């Protein structure tokens, strides 16, 4: 019953199809570019090729069966425009469109899209933090001064416990999760040790996870 | 600090760029297009127009003595491929680079690339693992079975504490943090309370947190 | 006197710049074409070439302080969708834009376009208006129902004074001026005769007009 | 019977097709690019994908039914140009053709066009009349000394009577209709109030006209 | 000499450049293309760059002084088209203009072109009835159907007099010159012999010739 | 039986080939552009869209049944070239081809095409001819010293007989024949008067027709 | 039961396609381009038209029934290389690929082509041997100081035997082989003699050779 | 030394020009595209940015002093056929061309090109003969019917004299040297063996090799 457009096949956007598909979804991928649609019909539902800055082609494709529209034409700025506009004006529910830069951002805020993405920034943002802190694996933002961050354990913390490395006390944040040999301990006792290159999700401010890589590592 | 040298100023190699001087990091933003250039000037320490295909440019802008270089093309497919081959020829640390699809990944593979992204791919997980499930804002995968999510409250969770909801026992989940009205509370006790729009992060093996995404909200 | 801006030296901006500099308005000319920017520079108070999607040559040009500011750009979309944002952007009071299709004016009208125009249009109406009747040279319509209506004088009229076409009781309509070699005349008498070939300026609603150029012309 | 061919549906020629046929008269749209012909189909009795700069295609349309035909082609001189050579030398009666510039509307007239509109300069010089006088909504020009203009009404003109407010005697023009929440008073009494964002159409010499907007305004 | 103006140096204005200035004559060589004014640079007496549909760059090159003004440029309708046109305008007395096809040619006869050529029709006509009859080598045609013909001899006619071969009587034609190893023969005699090989010029009707050239060669 | 066969129509091409079969022959028009064939297939005995730069086609249309071939390609030096190289290779009898330039007419001249044509300079020459000579309507060279020349009767010839204006004796030229109204009199007797706007053909050395020209014109 | 693939018809591609055929081999020719497909299909025991950069279509082909693949795509570098990273992830033994430049060969390298071919820098070199030494027509590089060397007969060995021209004392060479006229003689005995223009075919270290030919010849 | 030209610097012409600037010799490496002259500038004598084309860059090149002119343009058959004709025509005794195909270098025959080249047809005919016998490393051919050939050593030879293996009555050929180990034996004597991998150098029949090739090998 809940239906999915994914329009605008591209790296993110058939990403999204393909992953919407993997889910056990009901996925439609949509692209002007035969070649495009040739290689994500064996990964949606229904694949077409339609040219969606057309409204015909868009009402033929029933595009009002689809709860969400996902536009993921972000390097054609009046493509995607124009059919982020139809698709308002045809009431959809729910749109997410890829975005190019602030301004695409600004056009698609005014016309009425329900999302906005920025993935490549995003990324380029995350894969920065992973590159100037070389122990950073990952990470979750909780706000402007918390988070939780995955690490990859240390020559300084190789057979340590979580009492020998006291955080809660020494730095004010929580030992959260040890990851060795591919197990996964969750919520740790005090009693349980760390290994070099284990995976430590630890969580609390930036500023005291980055003392603990500074001096606990 | 450190020397960065991002190769291909796009979105996402822009986005690494103006991060990393953010973060007040050597970065030389390298580009073929000169209005490329010119846009991440004050963003950046040292911006120079020059092919990065071209080997006796890459002598002239000093690449061999970086020790993070980072080259961000994944359109061109060849471009990628000749300066990441070159780099690892001029014998460069830490090599880092944007791809496109599986064989531009495993022929970067194949000529030495340190780190391969797949910025949109995993951007397009994301975002369709949050459009299949709205509660879910952001999350990280521990492993392929145990994640920390994020989710938004719903209006069957409003003035309900914490012991009300029993998460270690009834789900084998932990509640990390509680995001209300601009304000955050990590690691919560039993009697705080949940209101509805809040942000609310946990823990715990992944089909275990959907079903209280199915049962509690 | 006042400060207009014509973005899009193009026919209609073109026109619009040429006329609006003969009554000795301060009009800058602006255009990305060089030619553009030297064909109207004899008819502008300034013309620079600039393009006008880039933020910071619109700051160059000075435009935040310019009261009117009208963007011809028709044809490309992005192009006159980004300018009009900037503009908004820059918080200017009057924005006169011209658009292409009904889509193009409804994205111009989400992001503040104070005033759209559609030349081309409006001529086609006016032009097949004058087609389907070959008596109509010129008209303006006072609202959906009634006109000011110009007629060209037929052999059905020469020599027939204006009583003797009651155009008050007979039809509801007023004849208002009555053009003859060159000279004309102003709200006529009752004892002012037609010929042909003249400019008869009546003024009613529609269907009596029409109603009139079939009985009596 | 009588029969309209527009050939090179654009802005200007699609307008002219759509408002004819609305009109109620067989029209035909002739276009090189099969996606115009597709859009406008539903908007003309006949549409038909046409190269009208070829002979054959032109007979083969049978141009030589049509009564009026419309070069709209305003973009490309040459082809305009020999399809209006080759319908003067079919003879067709009547034929109007879009201009693009003065040395285009010369080689129209040598060639014997019938009709030669410019349809972006007159609307460019309107706009730009109403641009530098705001009160200024619509007019029409009786020749280079007198018009009818339509105006917004006023701050000033609130509340006031047209004896109140006499253009006979204070400036030689005359008062000629008032528009008020959609109603409409033609010829009006001299008792006849205007309010406010009325509508007011005034006749009579053009500074005559501006002198009763700088004062009377 | 005279002032001659040759725009457009292709294969027939540069023959008309080179040949105009091997006998002394001041010719103007005019063309955009940068290499073609460089190629006719010593064939000329001055060689200028310049756009001839631009009316600016013609009063730069004082077109309006000139006595002629030939145009060659066939291929390229609208610029030969606006370039003729200008120099109507410009009052020129003797314009000169290449065409292409027949449609080209009436639109240069309606804007007042004074000489219109079409070199390669008359060199195809010459040349295909040099192949339908291999003694021709050159002919001249006084009317539709009187000429003066040159033969090349045949075996037939080696060693026979001009006497033995009457053509004033037998056939109506004159035989008018002899051309033999080099030298050559005007109005010969009846004692006169031809030899093979020689170049005949004889003139009279076609078809009386045509008969020569069966029954005697 | 005799065949001609006419590769690249052009204007040159197009010539011959519609010239050759309104003299009542067998003619192929060859193109590689099917609106050519479309065009001159009106005009041929037979009508084929080809490329004759490649071998199989040419031999699919039995090239090898043609006495003559004409290719009239002169604008693409190399097709030109190689379909000539490709004819001579084929055994056939004669080959005509259009040519560009000097150099051109060389390689023609290497790889053995039986005739070399040069349309446009020789029309250039003679256009110059009757440019610098105003009254030469037409004439034929002789030898690099003689030639018939028609002339347009003079202001000093009207009504003067042939032997009031005396050449044979006062320049050395031969009164050859006289055009007026229309009617066209041969080898003319002594009696036979000029008037003005006639035709006169005359023949003898450039230099005595030039003197003729000066002093007797 | 041996099957070669040839992907990449050219020059280089092309001849060893139609080489193996001629030796009575299975060969496939592959091509994007149908022209050549088409061209070589005279010459391959079969040819597709198939864009080997595209995977289904090479398994399409059966691409995994050839032990050889040749993969003659030498111009563009980013078809080659992910042509032949697909053969080599598709396990074909024997992967034989066309380079263009060291870098080139260093990818493929890289990417595990078995033999990585320079054709046209061998044959330069080889030329550049041919061309500074005249008297050398083909040799073979035994070492990087010994070759045998196929030289022309010269004007001082017309007439001369092998003990006359004694190379094992004077020299350290080796006689070889002698051709003349036609014939060949092999391992000759010490009293065969050498006419001019013969082929002499000798053996020995490269500086031996070259004074040989200094001093002998 | 000599005076060499190489125009036209591609893969084999790059070759030559090196490989001859590497011996010392006097090299001009002549092309249109600037990086190229770039490319090659310190492995040639002098490095000149020019048109071949061009008579007079040629005449600027000085070229009609040179006695070798390597023209290397194959893919651009015009290009290189009219610089052959030019360096012909400047009368340089030794003219050098690489061609593409059958056509091309039978022009090139017929304008007088001294010799002609195919270098990628030559070496797919060597590497298909290596591919269809996996045991040819090289070869040469004496004629259509005997060779020196190179062979890679096969178990079936490891530790066996060259008595043992009788080659000049068994088969009739004769074995000319052993490579092993980096050294090399020439003209070997009947007691030394054959170890596995090795260069076989023998010389004879073709059939007689190959019939080694199966017995022995
Ligand atoms: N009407 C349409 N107009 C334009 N593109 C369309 C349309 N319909 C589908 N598409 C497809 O949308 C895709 C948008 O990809 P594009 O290259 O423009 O963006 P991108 O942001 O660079 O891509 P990526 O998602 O890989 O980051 C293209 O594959 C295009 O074929
Ligand atoms: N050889 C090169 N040398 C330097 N810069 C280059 C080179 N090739 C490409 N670039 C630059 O790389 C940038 C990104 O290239 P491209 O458009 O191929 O990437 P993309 O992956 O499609 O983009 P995005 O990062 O936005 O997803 C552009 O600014 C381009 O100018
Ligand atoms: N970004 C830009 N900045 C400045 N000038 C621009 C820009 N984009 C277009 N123009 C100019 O706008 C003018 C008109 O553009 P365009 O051809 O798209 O309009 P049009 O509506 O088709 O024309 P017309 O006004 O004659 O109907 C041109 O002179 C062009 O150079
Ligand atoms: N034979 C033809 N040659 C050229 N255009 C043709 C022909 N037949 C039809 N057309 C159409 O005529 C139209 C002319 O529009 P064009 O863009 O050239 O003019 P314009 O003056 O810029 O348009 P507008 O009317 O919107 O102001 C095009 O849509 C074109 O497809
Ligand atoms: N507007 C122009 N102003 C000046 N020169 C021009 C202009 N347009 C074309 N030319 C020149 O006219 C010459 C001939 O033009 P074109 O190729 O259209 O003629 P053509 O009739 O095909 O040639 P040919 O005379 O050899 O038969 C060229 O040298 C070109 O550069
Ligand atoms: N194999 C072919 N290659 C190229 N042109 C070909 C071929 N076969 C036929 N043609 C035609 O030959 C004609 C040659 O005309 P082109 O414009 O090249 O020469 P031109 O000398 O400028 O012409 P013109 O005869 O009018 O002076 C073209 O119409 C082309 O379509
Ligand atoms: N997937 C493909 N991508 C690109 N080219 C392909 C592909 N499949 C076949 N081909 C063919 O491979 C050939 C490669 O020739 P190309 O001109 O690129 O190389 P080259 O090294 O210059 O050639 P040559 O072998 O003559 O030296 C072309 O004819 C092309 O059509
Ligand atoms: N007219 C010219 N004058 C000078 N250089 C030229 C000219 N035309 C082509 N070249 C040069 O010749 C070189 C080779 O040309 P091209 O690419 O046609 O040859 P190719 O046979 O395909 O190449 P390769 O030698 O690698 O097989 C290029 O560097 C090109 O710039
Ligand atoms: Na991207
Ligand atoms: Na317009
Ligand atoms: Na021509
Ligand atoms: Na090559």
């Given at each position: 019953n809940k239906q999915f457009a994914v329009i605008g096949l591209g790296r993110f956007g058939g990403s999204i199809c393909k992953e919407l598909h993997r889910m056990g979804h009901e996925v439609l991928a949509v692209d002007i570019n035969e070649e495009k649609v040739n290689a994500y019909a064996s990964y949606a539902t229904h694949a077409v090729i339609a040219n969606a800055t057309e409204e015909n082609e868009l009402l033929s494709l029933g595009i009002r069966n689809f709860e969400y529209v996902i536009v993921a034409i972000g390097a054609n700025i009046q493509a995607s425009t124009l059919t982020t506009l139809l698709l308002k004006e045809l009431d959809i529910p729910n749109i997410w469109v890829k975005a190019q830069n602030y301004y695409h951002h600004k056009v698609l805020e005014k016309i009425g899209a329900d999302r906005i993405i920025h993935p490549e920034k995003d990324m380029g943002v995350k894969i920065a933090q992973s590159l100037s802190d070389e122990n950073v694996l990952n990470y979750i933002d909780l706000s402007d001064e918390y988070s939780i961050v995955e690490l990859l354990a240390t020559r300084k913390l190789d057979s340590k416990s979580i009492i020998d490395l006291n955080?809660?006390?020494?730095?004010g944040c929580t030992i959260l999760a040890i990851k060795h040999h591919g197990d996964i301990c969750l919520s740790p006792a005090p009693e349980d040790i760390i290994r070099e290159q284990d995976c430590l999700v630890i969580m609390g401010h930036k500023k005291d996870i980055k003392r603990f890589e500074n001096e606990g590592m």
């Amino acid at each position: 019953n809940k239906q999915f457009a994914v329009i605008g096949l591209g790296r993110f956007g058939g990403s999204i199809c393909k992953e919407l598909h993997r889910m056990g979804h009901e996925v439609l991928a949509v692209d002007i570019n035969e070649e495009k649609v040739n290689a994500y019909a064996s990964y949606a539902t229904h694949a077409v090729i339609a040219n969606a800055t057309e409204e015909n082609e868009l009402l033929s494709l029933g595009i009002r069966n689809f709860e969400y529209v996902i536009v993921a034409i972000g390097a054609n700025i009046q493509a995607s425009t124009l059919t982020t506009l139809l698709l308002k004006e045809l009431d959809i529910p729910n749109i997410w469109v890829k975005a190019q830069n602030y301004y695409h951002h600004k056009v698609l805020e005014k016309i009425g899209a329900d999302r906005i993405i920025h993935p490549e920034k995003d990324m380029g943002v995350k894969i920065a933090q992973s590159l100037s802190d070389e122990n950073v694996l990952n990470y979750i933002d909780l706000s402007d001064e918390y988070s939780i961050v995955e690490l990859l354990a240390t020559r300084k913390l190789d057979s340590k416990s979580i009492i020998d490395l006291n955080v809660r006390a020494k730095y004010g944040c929580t030992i959260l999760a040890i990851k060795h040999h591919g197990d996964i301990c969750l919520s740790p006792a005090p009693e349980d040790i760390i290994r070099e290159q284990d995976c430590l999700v630890i969580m609390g401010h930036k500023k005291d996870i980055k003392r603990f890589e500074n001096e606990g590592m």
